[PDB]
Write a protein that binds this DNA or RNA. Sequence first.
RNA 1: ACUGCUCUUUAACAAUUUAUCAGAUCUGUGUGGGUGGCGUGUGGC
DNA 2: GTTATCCGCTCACAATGCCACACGCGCTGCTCGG
Lengths: 267, 255, 331, 98
Amino acid sequence: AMHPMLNIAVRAARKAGNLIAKNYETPDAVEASQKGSNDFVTNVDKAAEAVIIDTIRKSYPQHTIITEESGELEGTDQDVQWVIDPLDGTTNFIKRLPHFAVSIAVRIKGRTEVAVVYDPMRNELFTATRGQGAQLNGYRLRGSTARDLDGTILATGFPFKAKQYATTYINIVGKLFNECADFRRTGSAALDLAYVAAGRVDGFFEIGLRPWDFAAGELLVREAGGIVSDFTGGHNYMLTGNIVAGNPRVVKAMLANMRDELSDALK
Amino acid sequence: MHPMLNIAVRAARKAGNLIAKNYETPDANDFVTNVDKAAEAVIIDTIRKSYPQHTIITEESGELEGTDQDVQWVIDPLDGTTNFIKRLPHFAVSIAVRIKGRTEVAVVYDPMRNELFTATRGQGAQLNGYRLRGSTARDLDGTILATGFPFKAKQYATTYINIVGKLFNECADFRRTGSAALDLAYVAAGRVDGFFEIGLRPWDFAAGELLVREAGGIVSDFTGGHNYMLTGNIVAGNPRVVKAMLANMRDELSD
Amino acid sequence: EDMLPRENFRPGDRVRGVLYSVRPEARGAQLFVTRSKPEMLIELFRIEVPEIGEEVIEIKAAARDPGSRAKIAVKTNDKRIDPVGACVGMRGARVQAVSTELGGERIDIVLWDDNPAQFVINAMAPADVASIVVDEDKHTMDIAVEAGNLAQAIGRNGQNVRLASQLSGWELNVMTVDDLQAKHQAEAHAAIDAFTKYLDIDEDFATVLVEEGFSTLEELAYVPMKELLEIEGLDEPTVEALRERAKNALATIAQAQEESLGDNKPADDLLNLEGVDRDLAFKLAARGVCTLEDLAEQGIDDLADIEGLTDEKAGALIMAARNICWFGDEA
Amino acid sequence: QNQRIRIRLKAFDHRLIDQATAEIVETAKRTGAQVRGPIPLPTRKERFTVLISPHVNDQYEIRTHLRLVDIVEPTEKTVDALMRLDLAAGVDVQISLG
RNA sequence: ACUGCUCUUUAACAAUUUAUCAGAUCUGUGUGGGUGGCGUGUGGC
DNA sequence: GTTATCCGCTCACAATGCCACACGCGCTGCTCGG
Ligand SMILES: [Mg+2]
Ligand SMILES: [Mg+2]
């Protein structure tokens, strides 16, 4: 069989991805509409968001939904939350760079229950449900087999919206570059997390992430054999936007490596 | 200038077909060297069907010379092998047709996304039927820089880091894919504004520099000259971002 | 090729396509369905519009660039109906229905036309070609719009024309419809300067004598009274004053020659630089460099082909340009 | 088998409604299915609004037709031809079984 | 008996912005592939 | 009273290796099931 909420979510994600892909071939219609410090929100984001919300309301007119745009639309049954990013890495889309994904996760009683991310360009569908695992178009996902820092590929995002910590981040970057093999910088935390679940990157870390972006990936990597944490092993990440994740041994090595360079602001 | 590019794209398509068809098998650097050698083999053997006399320059065995030394063929059937090692679907074949020391034709082909960028002097740079334009930027605000780390020459890293630091205080964001040829192709289609790299080698970026130039852009070495052909410290893009980046990156010269 | 480009699929979902070939005998796959070949569109209208299939509004032609744009021309046999109100339907929703079904594949329901000229004209769905020059030996015609809408006529990536050429089969040409179009046929009568500068006082008298070309006025003006007797308006003092004005005209041709050699831009910022004589200025602008920044916008490979410019000279010249521009980072 | 294979059919188009209804009742009367009446309940007003990039700061009410046809004989070939023989889009085909 | 007298010759358009001269594979059926865990007891050395 | 001291009591923890042979290893009124 299959998990029901997962199924309705993947239907929503399919529709949204098809809409985004269809609009991707007319860059004269989607404009750059900035919201904060280089966080564009184009009209296509609004359209995809509305499509997803409509598709959901058919099957759950009572579930409270969360969205970076519409804040928090309450529902008559607010024990279960629907966190959405209709588009991740808006910048990668405006530059028409074909690497982005829509992310839909459903939390139950606070604990994340199901998650999906969908890249329409490569047509890849990372699904994950707790107690059953993670799948990539039908293949199980056990993350990277790395157990050190050598030969390891580290995906990351830069605090290009919280540039005050830049130095700090860059500091640690240098430290990391003394032990790892190579970096990756794609521009969509959801897809980076997904890659962590697929072992295509030996780990990942980031500073300054909104609570509505990792919610679709943290469960992905969790049911993908990997683990997440704050920059110190705690769990305040859900509030600090500071994530470090990967297969367990690599996470341990990274934490022991980063704990010193860390500026005590994030602690 | 048609038939040269004809053979070029023919070999490119066959090589990409081979690479993808192979990539559909599971695994968990033997395999990548195997497929690299096999792709080079199919490439060159399809080449010798026409002009089995041009001098091929691969990335492995130096320069496979020939009896008609008027044309060199720079080849890389795989760039950023790390990708194909770790299943990340981002890698492209890079073919460059150079003559008299300079390059005339270039073709980069991503099999996975089935992208194919051709480029040649005057007739421009096409993406399967598109008069490319590069980006439209004129500054370093709200811009993207396709970066690159020395995963073999970490000594520069420190000053490199400094660059990054200063760059981060100027630009908007960064990218990193590992396939320098793909970075070049992306700055050609304006998918990312500026590109730079510390110590690359001609076999990879030979086609990509021709791409970015043909798309209305320009290349340079770190110190504005042209020793990049031998130093591979590339900085490329449309002149706007190239000035906006060089002005702030040259003051940390170490090469 | 048979799939749409961006039509994402997933094992478990149903899709629609047209069975374009069956192979019960071949040693492998025996059923061949496509979704790209144009007849699909045709048959899909069959399954959508209750007119087509009832043989009242038959689908004549349909050209298609997948997932991007599909032009279609249909004729009507009963004058009771027309495509705009029934084949487009109410509020244009049926074509919208098939569009959404084929993945936002925009469609151009163009009213078929049987006059090959008007046929290829209408098939240009968004356009207005107010100047047609029909020819069949080459199939090409001046099919273009007023200056400014040329993008709106060719459409993105040539679609709005690449389809019509695919649809009409007649090769197409899109240059202009108001400017630059008489140049094809009304080129010897469109030189507004001299003819009207002589006509402003002739508007009381008459037009000018077209039965002789007189474009090459020099020789054909040395014809006897015959030409001057046959026609009126070109009086003898008129011909003599106009010969003085034609002295002004040949001097004007010489002066235009002089002016056409003015955009080279030898400036101090472009002349005194190292290795730069005035002839280096003339050479660098002989490629089209009318400023100093342009010199700093090319590499040795692109500034090549100059008649007497090596790689090291142009190298140091690019270096000078990037010093005066990009090394000191100044102007 | 069970009786109430009752298909209601909303739409805004008319002639294709007729085509679909005729084809459906054809399958019914051809497959042995004892068709009931199409019985088009009174055409209803249905509110629209321009939910696109509007005019700078166009049907808004339409006569949606309703065909409420019923089939009470579900042979094997009935469901066979039904799921086989297709229908145009732009029609609401919420059916009931019971 | 005792709410019920013409309203006046059929669906009523979405398509849209460089630009072009259109720009070899249709093979197999060689083949590996079609009762134990524990406990207890006895006896032996 | 404090403060530590030591002591009686409690509880955990060990029991040769092999072999060989033999024997045996849910149930029971709820659940279901037609
Ligand atoms: Mg988002
Ligand atoms: Mg290589």
